[PDB]
């Protein structure tokens, strides 16, 4: 009898859709929902679009892929329990297809019954407030230009956190002659071609983004970290370098001394958490990070507990976390899962973020992940799926990275849901400058 | 007594702060003013800034100039009637000046006294209501991330509408191999050397940013217009065609049959009046126009008489017309003006929005735009200019632009204040690479 509203339907949005499209089969009567998408359509990040900055409508664009994107993880590590990749696909496929495949993937999960007509499309959440027990919630219908308003029982917020970027100043950008962008303006790496490319950052963005301008032709691409360099052996026409110092007219100046001549500089600088549309009151604030605190299981605000977040944290697992993640918050919603009291709960966080702040090294990484997925996994009935496979992959898919960064996805995984192994792809990646999904699904 | 808020420090809220200034000079009170301005410095679009679509704090990049941008009107057109380029330059300088000249003026006219201090920078308004006569405003604190709050009598709106970009698609741009931007996005046309450039649009916007690529070196410009061309004479190597029906990979495909190599599209395709941070009621929402409805002389909100607007209309006139909407408005504010009766505003705002409905030309809208603007100057005390000598100016200037797109900038207006002839610049636009102030000042 109650009322739920989802912002947002990619991934996160649609795990919890479809988690309650679940029990509506069964037979079982559930809230009202609705879930609001400023997009035109469902998927998120996995949608491409040409668009920068803000849309026709001066709505800030969320999203954040380019084109000739290729999934970065094996996608056996993503598979939904309840939606096999053998079930969509019919059989077997390559472990890291082009994000179109799994888009494609996502999507079919959800097309088949009423979810769709749930969701409002170019409709912005732009103001939410609690008052008298609901959430107060204010809209925008982009395409009118009209502020709507409706009230609900719970509010899940499923907006991501990889659209909104976090863009640093270096010294000299304000005379740079060339074009400086963040890795979220990034669209196609033709547009580069023959060009020196400076990107700075030290994470998969960066990572990505330099080998996307060199695959594309770019004339040199100069990876500068802060930190520690990642260190992958990256083909000849790249190189990595400690510390962007300046940029001097057309020349990049590193604290290392290294000198380039740079046509574009690409801040792979990661990404804000960014909620204008949520009262302070009830507003996440954190860095990216594997567990942020204030989120009960990761998923229930502290102070509010019919304020439910999901894909908050920093990401190894995905899919399937989201899954576990909104199947633990329908749960909630539905009262199957009762809150434990406060004090249990800043308990339960304090653990977790303990446990957290202590991690190392990516294997470390993977494996908490991987704990606190099962762990959701476990207080709910999201169908089964063999995590420990999935812990042993993303350690594998670790050594592959660093064994070479250039062939990591011409691997092949076993499927956690049904055992299925991934042929091996008809082209390699370092090769495959085709990424549409018929070029994939084809034969060569 | 009262409380003001203005929102944004660009050209219009430092006209009306420089309005009040000059009131508190002579001894007078007034009320207490604080500005909101969302980057961390005053100028508005006179400032240039590296930085596109958000900053670093989420928020949307205000700035839409580009390095190497010369003023595109004769400056005699926007001279400040009490800030005379005389007065700030301390002798005669050509009529069309890089950015720099002409925001180092802006900024010098309010740099003397009290004005910087009332302003808060990096502050973002995000929420406004009237609520029990008064704007109860909702601010971001951007530094550090919180949202602050506070009450005021009165709110200017002066945050233009040149900011937030008018972006249409057209098919074949999802697989279009090269760089899709807005104008809005343009900082350094250095990035376009050597390339194939497309730009849609037929207004000053498409008009300057193709005469910029080609200046630095673009292999091609080809313009794009959907309803009649711009006409002027462009140079060897620029032309203008027919609708964009669609990009086919590095091509596109005009509807008048052209097929053009594209290396990058730039949708010179204006801005929205956009005011997420004000309540539905007090939401100004028209088109890029001469005289929007609403507007009571142009600035007070028909259904909120203590909201006032600046800047809003489109644009022949600049800087003084936002003076002479300034001072009307802080007469307004102040209760020197008084508004008449709810059927003569709703009067006089149809018999100047029926007069704009009905212009046909460059010449009649200049024209239009006078009389807005010498009607404004009558009812306050903004000091004397020579309105007359400008429209005569913009006329002149439209034939500048026909005659010769490539030498307009190399023309000598007089000042309307003044009386000073500007010099011809030492080098012809075209050549013109150096647009330090310092080699502009002689
Ligand atoms: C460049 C890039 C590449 C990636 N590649 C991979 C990969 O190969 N494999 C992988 O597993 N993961 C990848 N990811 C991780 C990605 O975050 C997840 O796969 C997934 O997209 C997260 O889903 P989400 O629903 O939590 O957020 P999102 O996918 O961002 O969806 C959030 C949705 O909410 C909407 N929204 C936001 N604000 C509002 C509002 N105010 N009102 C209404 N709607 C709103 C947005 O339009 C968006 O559609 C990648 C991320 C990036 C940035
Ligand atoms: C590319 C370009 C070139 C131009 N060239 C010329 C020229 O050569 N000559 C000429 O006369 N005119 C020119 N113009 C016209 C220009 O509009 C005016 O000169 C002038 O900039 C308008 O001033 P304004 O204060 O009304 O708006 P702006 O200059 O845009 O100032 C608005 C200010 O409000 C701030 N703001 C916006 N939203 C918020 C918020 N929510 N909270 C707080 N602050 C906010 C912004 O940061 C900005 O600083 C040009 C315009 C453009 C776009
Ligand atoms: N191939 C793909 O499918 C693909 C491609 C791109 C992105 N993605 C996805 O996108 C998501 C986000 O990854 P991300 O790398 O964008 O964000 P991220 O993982 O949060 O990394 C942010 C990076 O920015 C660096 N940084 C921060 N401040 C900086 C400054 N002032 N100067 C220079 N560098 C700075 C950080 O390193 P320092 O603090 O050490 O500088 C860090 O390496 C991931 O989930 C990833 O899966 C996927
Ligand atoms: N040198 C300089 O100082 C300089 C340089 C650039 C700009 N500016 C300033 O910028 C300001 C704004 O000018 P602006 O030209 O950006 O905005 P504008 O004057 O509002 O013009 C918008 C243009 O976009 C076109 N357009 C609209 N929809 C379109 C679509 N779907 N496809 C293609 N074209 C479309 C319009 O023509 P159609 O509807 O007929 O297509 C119109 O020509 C001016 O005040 C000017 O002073 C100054």
Same mark, same amino acid.
């Given at each position: 009898?109650?009322?739920?509203?989802?912002?947002?339907?990619?991934?996160?949005? +649609?795990?919890?859709?479809?988690?309650?499209?679940?029990?509506?089969?069964?037979?079982?009567?559930?809230?009202?929902?609705?879930?609001?998408?400023? !997009?035109?359509?469902?998927?998120?990040?996995?949608?491409?679009?040409?668009?920068?900055?803000?849309?026709?409508?001066?709505?800030?664009?969320?999203?954040?892929?380019? @084109?000739?994107?290729?999934?970065?993880?094996?996608?056996?590590?993503?598979?939904?329990?309840?939606?096999?990749?053998?079930?969509?696909?019919?059989?077997?496929?390559?472990?890291?297809?082009?994000?179109?495949?799994?888009?494609?993937?996502?999507?079919?999960?959800?097309?088949?019954?009423?979810?769709?007509?749930?969701?409002?499309?170019?409709?912005?959440?732009?103001?939410?407030?609690?008052?008298?027990?609901?959430?107060?919630?204010?809209?925008?219908?982009?395409?009118?230009?009209?502020? +709507?308003?409706?009230?609900?029982?719970?509010?899940?917020?499923?907006?991501?956190?990889?659209?909104?970027?976090?863009?640093?100043?270096?010294?000299?950008?304000?005379?740079?002659?060339?074009?400086?962008?963040?890795?979220?303006?990034? @669209?196609?790496?033709?547009?580069?071609?023959?060009?020196?490319?400076?990107?700075?950052?030290?994470?998969?963005?960066?990572?990505?983004?330099?080998?996307?301008?060199?695959?594309?032709?770019?004339?040199?691409?100069?990876?500068?970290?802060?930190?520690?360099?990642?260190?992958?052996?990256?083909?000849?026409? #790249?190189?990595?370098?400690?510390?962007?110092?300046?940029?001097?007219?057309?020349?990049?100046?590193?604290?290392?001394?290294?000198? !380039?001549?740079?046509?574009?500089?690409?801040?792979?600088?990661?990404?804000?958490?960014?909620?204008?549309?949520?009262?302070?009151?009830?507003?996440?604030?954190?860095?990216? @990070?594997?567990?942020?605190?204030?989120?009960?299981?990761?998923?229930?605000?502290?102070?509010?507990?019919?304020? +439910?977040?999901?894909? #908050? !944290?920093?990401?190894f697992?995905?899919?399937?976390?989201?899954?576990?993640?909104?199947?633990?918050?329908?749960?909630?919603?539905?009262?199957?899962?009762?809150?434990?009291?406060?004090?249990?709960?800043?308990?339960?966080?304090?653990?977790?973020?303990?446990?957290?702040?202590?991690l190392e090294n990516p294997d470390q990484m993977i494996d908490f992940?991987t704990?606190?997925?099962?762990?959701?996994?476990?207080?709910?009935?999201?169908?089964?799926?063999?995590?420990?496979?999935?812990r042993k992959?993303f350690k594998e898919?670790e050594h592959?990275?660093?064994?070479?960064?250039?062939?990591?996805?011409?691997?092949?995984?076993?499927?956690?849901?049904?055992?299925?192994?991934?042929?091996?792809?008809?082209?390699?990646?370092?090769?495959?400058?085709?990424?549409?999904?018929?070029?994939?699904?084809?034969?060569?």
């Amino acid at each position: 009898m109650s009322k739920v509203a989802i912002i947002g339907a990619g991934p996160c949005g +649609l795990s919890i859709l479809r988690a309650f499209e679940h029990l509506e089969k069964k037979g079982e009567k559930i809230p009202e929902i609705v879930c609001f998408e400023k !997009q035109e359509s469902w998927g998120g990040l996995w949608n491409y679009n040409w668009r920068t900055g803000s849309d026709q409508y001066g709505d800030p664009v969320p999203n954040s892929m380019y @084109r000739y994107l290729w999934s970065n993880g094996p996608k056996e590590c993503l598979e939904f329990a309840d939606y096999s990749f053998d079930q969509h696909f019919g059989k077997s496929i390559p472990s890291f297809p082009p994000r179109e495949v799994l888009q494609d993937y996502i999507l079919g999960r959800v097309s088949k019954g009423n979810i769709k007509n749930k969701i409002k499309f170019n409709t912005r959440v732009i103001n939410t407030v609690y008052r008298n027990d609901k959430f107060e919630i204010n809209y925008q219908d982009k395409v009118n230009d009209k502020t +709507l308003s409706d009230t609900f029982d719970y509010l899940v917020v499923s907006t991501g956190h990889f659209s909104v970027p976090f863009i640093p100043e270096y010294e000299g950008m304000s005379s740079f002659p060339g074009r400086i962008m963040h890795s979220h303006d990034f @669209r196609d790496a033709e547009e580069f071609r023959g060009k020196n490319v400076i990107v700075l950052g030290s994470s998969y963005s960066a990572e990505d983004v330099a080998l996307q301008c060199n695959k594309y032709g770019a004339k040199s691409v100069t990876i500068g970290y802060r930190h520690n360099p990642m260190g992958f052996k990256w083909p000849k026409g #790249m190189k990595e370098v400690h510390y962007l110092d300046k940029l001097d007219g057309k020349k990049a100046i590193f604290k290392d001394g290294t000198e !380039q001549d740079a046509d574009v500089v690409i801040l792979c600088t990661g990404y804000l958490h960014h909620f204008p549309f949520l009262d302070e009151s009830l507003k996440l604030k954190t860095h990216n @990070r594997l567990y942020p605190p204030k989120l009960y299981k990761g998923v229930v605000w502290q102070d509010n507990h019919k304020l +439910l977040y999901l894909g #908050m !944290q920093d990401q190894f697992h995905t899919f399937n976390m989201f899954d576990c993640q909104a199947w633990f918050a329908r749960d909630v919603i539905m009262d199957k899962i009762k809150m434990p009291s406060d004090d249990e709960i800043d308990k339960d966080i304090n653990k977790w973020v303990s446990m957290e702040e202590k991690l190392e090294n990516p294997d470390q990484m993977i494996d908490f992940q991987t704990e606190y997925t099962k762990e959701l996994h476990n207080i709910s009935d999201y169908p089964k799926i063999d995590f420990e496979l999935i812990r042993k992959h993303f350690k594998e898919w670790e050594h592959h990275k660093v064994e070479d960064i250039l062939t990591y996805r011409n691997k092949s995984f076993s499927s956690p849901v049904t055992g299925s192994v991934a042929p091996v792809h008809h082209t390699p990646w370092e090769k495959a400058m085709d990424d549409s999904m018929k070029t994939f699904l084809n034969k060569r």
